[PDB]
Design a protein around this ligand. Structure first.
Ligand SMILES: Nc1ncnc2c1ncn2[C@@H]1O[C@H](COP(=O)(O)OP(=O)(O)OP(O)(O)=S)[C@@H](O)[C@H]1O
Ligand SMILES: Nc1ncnc2c1ncn2[C@@H]1O[C@H](COP(=O)(O)OP(=O)(O)O)[C@@H](O)[C@H]1O
Ligand SMILES: Nc1ncnc2c1ncn2[C@@H]1O[C@H](COP(=O)(O)OP(=O)(O)O)[C@@H](O)[C@H]1O
Ligand SMILES: [Mg+2]
Ligand SMILES: [Mg+2]
Ligand SMILES: [Mg+2]
Lengths: 481, 273, 96, 193, 90
């Protein structure tokens, strides 16, 4: 009964219906429908009371959403033509970027990553028994109260192919698919869990950190295989899991704690991080001027008089009817699948091994192995490039490598904020302090001392002096004036 | 009439056909010593390196002779290999490749299955009306190659159950009212991650994996996969992935969406053959 | 029936408020200040205006809301910094 | 009410009005009264929304009328609920499903926070109650709605309730020199929300 | 264009990034010569920069050579040594 009606304190009553051959199977459960059918009564087998039901003469969708898209273009050639025109115009990429997460005040590269993930990485089926894994799951780490859960909810509202959930709200057993005993069959049947629903959909879930870890281990395997293999209770069913999971974990003590050891920071096991293949950070912005500007934005969206003008400003140019954004996203993920690396090949042949070499650089800065967390990051990154080029789709069209380079840079520094040390930046800060404790008082000045000690620092230069300057640079005519 | 076709991707119901042409083929290579290495290379063509690992999995695939004795003691010819590897070491895909390569291919993960369910469920069935035997994997395991992933995560009761039942290759199933003993001889591959994210040499291997040596000794091969990275080998892996990625699947339009269709196989029954 | 509306508001007053909120969480006795805290201040202003019962929010009633929230924050601090912070916010307190 | 509204000093009278039987506590009275009035709900683009309800965090020494303050609060905001804190749990307060042998299927059990929805939510003894339940409450309050997917029940219930948590300082006495987080035995994220 | 003229083309330059992937292999390079802050002579291109081993290096006698100039060079890189052991410098 009418989820909007919300009868206060009344359990929602349900009535049975019947459909005819040209009415049956039109709509799925969990979808609202405006019905026109005769009120109907029959005896279930309590005096003179009989089962109330409805015999339907017409079916209309209250949700109004079209049925399972069988590629029949209700948008027709016209709407998809302007969709391609938006793909033709590279500026529309930033339009979609800005439009996502209204009132967020920035985080544009984050929104770009979100758009790319929602866009769907292409699953390639090799002639071998293997098959390239298309979808990816993005990890959300950072300080609380930073619209992260808000952004997750917004994204899920944008794309209903999956369902927003929360860790505690989702049953710990069978998160992907729970096993339940049917009332009329004592056998525990397989009930579709969230990632069954999330399969074929980009899914956002809350409170990853708050969730018990043990079953979250069962999630990484399912997303890795893109299926869900169950042999529990003597039932060997395997169900596909084509989903893009958006994490929600405030790493430790709420805040991101970037200036602390990643093991302390990331309560999740680093194997889970690698298997989910994505990494991301929300840090403390500071920037009191930017904080002022954020306050302006938040009040503007908060006060209806101002809210309206930002609403129309976003709508005319950028927010462009979020619903038909979702429609275009469906059409253009249909446009993903045809080809995702025509323009890549030549430039990627260099940049792939390039990023591999920067990963080698990273292990060079992370001598002593910097503990377990940093070792597998190179492997998750090499898989990350392969999946993330498809994630970026070639952009709306044919712009894969030139932006994937920047995105890989963003991820590299993302991990470096946590992979610089096993206290993280605090240890290199201590290193640059125990460096500078001689620089002014001794250690000569003006690179002459660097030309003097260790015989022009040559032995010190390759590793020790590089570690020195990497710590020094942060504390030590184009933008200001 | 019924045509059983349970082979993956609609194959030959896991029943490989045979011709005298094919019979005389291969054999001349079998005389050549390199044939074993060629077969090893053929395995996991999507993966780069791990040649010794590929030889090990090849040896896995071929089935040993179950030596029998005039007593309760019957020697097992099954091949059991345990492997520990870092995440994303392709071993999961490796297990998957063994799966799609094997005929029976009973595979799951440590969290994938319930140990009692896979071994034996002695619950009743309502239609039957009395207590039923329901072996999720065990009865499926016997007479076929089987796999297990992330056995470190596997329920410890299942671990102790598999212990000595994979050594004796038979399960008594004397639990509850039913006491019939059913044989469970099969070849099993184990792929469990280290307790630490990656195997640390400073840590002991049994420090790196908490799985006890109980039946861990009863693995015909033991393997450690470490994702250490070297410029030459890193370039090798990268180039392999580059070849695998830009490669359009066989035929099809270059700008064509993935089909993975039903294949509309008209041939059914002896037509399918 | 009463639904006060923020039709009139003091943008930059709230701006300087959140600015002062910053570089205080650095104190060991100070909890972090976030955006949801600012939204809290806004909803406290709404609650005050509903308490005033006018269908339109009053700027000075919103000012008392600011005062209440900032006083709560100051009380949340360690007493050692609390005095310095109260002197700092005194430029805001008198306006109430 | 209109006539008193145009009368000035109404706000101070209301502050004096809330829990008069608790002498003093002028700031506390102000806070609880304005929570009773509650903020204006805000929604953006239909989907993006801002809660109109106020979550009051209270730290009180034992015997400081906190439960009685809550009792005065209730019966004043009509729709009201009481959370014993320790008595309720993650399932009990937020959203509960009950297996129903008479009907033979799993059935929804009234989540006390759903009872909180549409009205004021009283919370007591919260600083002593279970932490996993606390995280469940965090989740529920973040969206002003409780989403539950278990036992075949995937329902989600709106939870619009102004909540007021009751807490005792570490040892029952707050140390002003001590930082609040050290004076608080609970998590940082909850005080943030 | 000149390498197309030399041979459809003569030996081709190898992206600095593609260099270090193999140690003992010889390659053709084109990049800007400058002093590396390590102290070695570095050849730099948009893809990156490589320190150049000035030893075992024969200049082309027809041209001057000063820092801050482009150059076509042939040699081994020695990824372990990380300095391009250029043989002929043109
Ligand atoms: N940069 C921002 N721009 C706009 N609003 C923001 C920003 N950061 C935080 N907010 C607001 O602060 C609220 C707090 O975020 P929530 O939606 O509660 O979830 P969250 O940010 O993940 O918080 P946690 O970590 O779950 S306690 C958001 O809903 C936004 O309204
Ligand atoms: N040597 C390799 N060659 C090719 N791909 C590899 C190699 N090692 C790992 N991978 C890739 O790593 C990804 C994850 O492998 P997976 O089977 O999940 O790892 P694990 O061995 O830890 O179980 C796959 O896409 C796989 O192709
Ligand atoms: N300012 C006050 N005026 C009147 N009664 C008060 C005041 N402060 C505390 N009390 C009394 O303290 C008693 C204890 O209240 P309660 O909330 O149950 O205590 P606790 O602090 O242990 O939770 C109440 O009966 C209340 O009347
Ligand atoms: Mg959250
Ligand atoms: Mg694996
Ligand atoms: Mg009390």
């Amino acid at each position: 009964e009418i989820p909007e009606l919300v009868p206060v304190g009344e359990m929602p009553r349900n009535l049975t219906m019947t459909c005819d051959r040209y009415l049956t199977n039109k709509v799925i459960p969990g979808t609202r429908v405006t019905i026109v059918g005769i009120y109907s009564i029959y005896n279930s087998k309590g005096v003179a009371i009989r089962t109330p039901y409805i015999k339907i003469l017409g079916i209309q969708s209250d949700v109004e959403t079209s049925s399972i898209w069988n590629s029949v273009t209700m948008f027709t050639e016209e709407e998809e033509e302007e969709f391609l025109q938006l793909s033709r115009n590279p500026k529309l990429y930033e339009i979609l970027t800005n439009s996502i997460a209204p009132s967020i005040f920035g985080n544009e590269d984050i929104k770009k990553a979100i758009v790319c993930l929602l866009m769907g990485g292409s699953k390639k089926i090799l002639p071998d028994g293997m098959r390239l894994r298309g979808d990816i799951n993005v990890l959300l780490l950072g300080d609380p109260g930073t619209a992260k859960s808000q952004l997750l909810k917004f994204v899920e509202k944008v794309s209903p192919i999956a369902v927003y959930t929360s860790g505690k709200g989702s049953s710990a057993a069978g998160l992907t698919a729970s096993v339940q005993r049917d009332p009329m069959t004592r056998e525990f049947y397989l009930e579709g869990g969230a990632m069954v629903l999330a399969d074929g959909g980009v899914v956002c879930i809350d409170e990853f950190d708050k969730m018990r870890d043990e079953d979250r281990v069962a999630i990484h395997e399912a997303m890795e295989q893109q299926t869900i293999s169950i042999a529990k209770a003597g039932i060997t069913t395997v169900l596909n899991s084509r989903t893009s999971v958006l994490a929600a974990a405030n790493p430790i003590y709420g805040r991101y704690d970037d200036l602390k050891s990643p093991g302390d920071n990331i309560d999740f096991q680093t194997t889970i991080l690698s298997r989910f293949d994505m990494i991301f950070i929300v840090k403390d912005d500071h920037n009191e001027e930017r904080d002022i500007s954020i306050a302006n934005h938040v009040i503007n969206i908060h006060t209806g008089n101002a809210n309206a003008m930002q609403n129309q400003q976003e709508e005319n140019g950028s927010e462009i009817s979020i619903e038909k954004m979702k429609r275009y996203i469906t059409y253009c993920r249909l446009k993903c699948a045809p080809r995702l690396s025509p323009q890549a090949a030549e430039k990627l042949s260099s940049n792939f091994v390039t990023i591999r070499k920067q990963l080698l650089i990273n292990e060079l800065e992370s001598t002593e192995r910097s503990s377990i967390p940093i070792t597998i990051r190179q492997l998750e990154a090499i898989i990350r490039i392969t999946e993330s080029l498809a994630k970026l789709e070639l952009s709306p069209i044919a712009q894969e490598r030139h932006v994937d380079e920047a995105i890989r840079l963003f991820q590299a520094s993302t991990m470096d904020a946590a992979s610089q040390d096993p206290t993280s930046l605090s240890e290199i800060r201590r290193f640059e302090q125990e460096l500078k404790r001689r620089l002014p008082i001794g250690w000569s000045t003006s690179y002459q001392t660097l030309r003097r000690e260790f015989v022009d620092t040559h032995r010190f230069s390759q590793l020790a002096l590089d570690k020195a300057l990497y710590a020094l640079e942060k504390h030590e005519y184009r933008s200001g004036v | 009439t019924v045509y059983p076709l349970h082979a993956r991707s609609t194959g030959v119901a896991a029943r490989q056909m045979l011709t005298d042409f094919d019979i005389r083929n291969i054999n001349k290579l079998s005389k050549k010593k390199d044939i074993f290495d060629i077969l090893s290379q053929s395995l996991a063509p999507s993966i780069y390196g791990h040649d010794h690992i590929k030889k090990a999995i090849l040896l896995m695939l071929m089935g040993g002779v179950e030596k029998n004795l005039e007593n309760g003691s019957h020697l097992r010819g099954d091949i059991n290999i345990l492997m520990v590897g870092d995440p994303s070491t392709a071993k999961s895909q490796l297990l998957r490749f063994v799966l799609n390569t094997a005929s029976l291919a009973i595979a799951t993960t440590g969290r994938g299955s319930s140990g009692v369910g896979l071994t034996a469920a002695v619950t009743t069935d309502r239609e039957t009306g009395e207590r039923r035997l329901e072996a999720g994997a065990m009865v499926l395991a016997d007479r076929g190659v089987v796999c297990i992933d992330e056995f470190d995560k596997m329920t410890d009761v299942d671990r102790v159950a598999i212990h000595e039942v994979m050594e004796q290759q038979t399960v008594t199933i004397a639990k509850a009212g039913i006491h019939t003993t059913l044989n469970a001889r099969c070849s099993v591959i184990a792929a469990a991650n280290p307790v630490f994210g990656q195997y640390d040499v400073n840590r002991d291997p049994h420090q790196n994996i908490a799985l006890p040596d109980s039946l861990l000794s009863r693995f015909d091969l033991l393997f450690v996969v470490t994702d250490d990275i070297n410029e030459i080998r890193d370039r090798s892996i990268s180039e392999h992935v580059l070849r695998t990625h830009r490669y359009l699947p066989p035929g099809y339009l270059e700008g064509e969406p993935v089909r993975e269709r039903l294949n509309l196989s008209l041939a059914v029954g002896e037509d399918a053959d | 029936k009463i639904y006060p509306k923020l039709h009139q508001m003091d943008m930059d007053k709230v701006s300087r408020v959140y600015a002062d909120l910053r570089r205080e969480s650095i104190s060991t006795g100070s909890f972090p200040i976030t955006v949801r805290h600012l939204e809290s201040i806004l909803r406290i202003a709404e609650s005050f205006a509903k308490m005033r019962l006018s269908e339109f929010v009053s700027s000075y009633d919103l000012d008392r809301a600011i005062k209440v929230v900032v006083d709560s924050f100051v009380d949340a601090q360690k007493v050692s910094v609390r005095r310095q912070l109260r002197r700092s916010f005194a430029i805001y307190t008198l306006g109430h | 009410f209109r006539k008193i509204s145009r009368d000035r000093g109404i706000i101070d009278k209301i502050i004096s009005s809330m829990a008069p039987s608790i002498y003093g506590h002028r700031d506390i009275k102000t806070a609880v009264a304005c929570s009773l009035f509650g903020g204006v709900p805000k929604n953006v683009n239909g989907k993006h929304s801002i809660r109109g309800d106020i979550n009051v965090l209270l730290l009180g020494d034992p015997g400081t009328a906190k439960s009685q303050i809550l009792k005065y609060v209730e019966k004043t905001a009509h729709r009201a609920v009481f959370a014993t804190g320790q008595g309720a749990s993650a399932v009990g307060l937020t959203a509960s499903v009950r297996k129903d042998p008479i009907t033979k299927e799993w059935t929804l059990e009234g989540g006390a926070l759903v009872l909180a929805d549409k009205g004021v939510c009283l919370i007591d003894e919260f600083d002593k109650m279970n932490d996993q339940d606390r995280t469940s409450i965090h989740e529920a309050m973040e969206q002003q709605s409780i989403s539950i997917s278990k036992a075949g029940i995937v329902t989600t219930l709106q939870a619009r309730c102004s909540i007021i948590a009751a807490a005792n300082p570490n040892g029952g006495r707050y140390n002003s020199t001590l930082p609040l987080a050290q004076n608080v035995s609970l998590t940082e994220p909850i005080l943030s929300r | 264009r000149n390498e197309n003229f030399q041979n459809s083309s003569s030996m081709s330059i190898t992206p600095i990034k593609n260099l270090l992937g193999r140690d003992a292999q010889n390659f053709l390079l084109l990049g800007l010569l400058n002093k590396n802050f390590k102290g070695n002579w570095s050849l730099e291109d948009p893809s990156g920069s490589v320190e150049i081993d000035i030893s075992q290096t024969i200049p082309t006698q027809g041209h001057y050579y000063v820092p801050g100039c482009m150059v076509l060079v042939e040699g081994i890189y020695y990824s372990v040594g990380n300095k391009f052991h250029v043989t002929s410098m043109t």
